[PDB]
């Protein structure tokens, strides 16, 4: 019968081929996962729908941040097939207090601290 599927940890071990593809250097790993939902919550077990609600992704196309740590990894692993994952990277340092309001997200996972809203 259908039950919770335990995944082998060996699958989540990036090879050098995967490293060159996605450009994610193993050393200096990123800290935060940008998470977004695509597949519906319906037609999924009770444990799959409440976890994504416990993560706070009942709304689709809503970027939400989580940590890159083994504890939260187990959560969005079992419901990995309901969401997109994208790493967080920024050139302009952490958001300063003066630039809290003028932030802006990008499709490439970027989070610019400054947003003056006009081209070069």
């Amino acid at each position: 019968k259908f039950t919770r599927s335990r995944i082998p940890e060996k699958v989540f071990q990036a090879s050098p081929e995967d490293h060159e593809k996605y450009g994610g250097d193993p050393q200096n790993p990123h800290k935060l996962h940008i998470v977004t939902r695509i597949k519906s919550t319906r037609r999924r077990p009770y444990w799959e729908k409440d976890i994504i609600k416990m993560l706070g992704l009942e709304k689709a196309h809503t970027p939400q941040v989580h940590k890159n740590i083994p504890s939260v990894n187990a959560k969005l692993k079992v419901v990995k097939h309901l969401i997109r994952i994208k790493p967080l990277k920024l050139p302009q340092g952490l958001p300063a207090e003066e630039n809290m309001s003028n932030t802006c997200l990008k499709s490439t996972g970027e989070l610019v601290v400054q947003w003056h809203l006009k081209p070069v």
Partner: peptide
């Protein structure tokens, strides 16, 4: 939208410093 991004920015700073 600005309040959403503001709480989003305050959240990310909270998440990073805790780690």
């Amino acid at each position: 939208r600005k309040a959403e991004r503001e709480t989003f920015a305050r959240r990310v700073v909270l998440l990073s410093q805790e780690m």
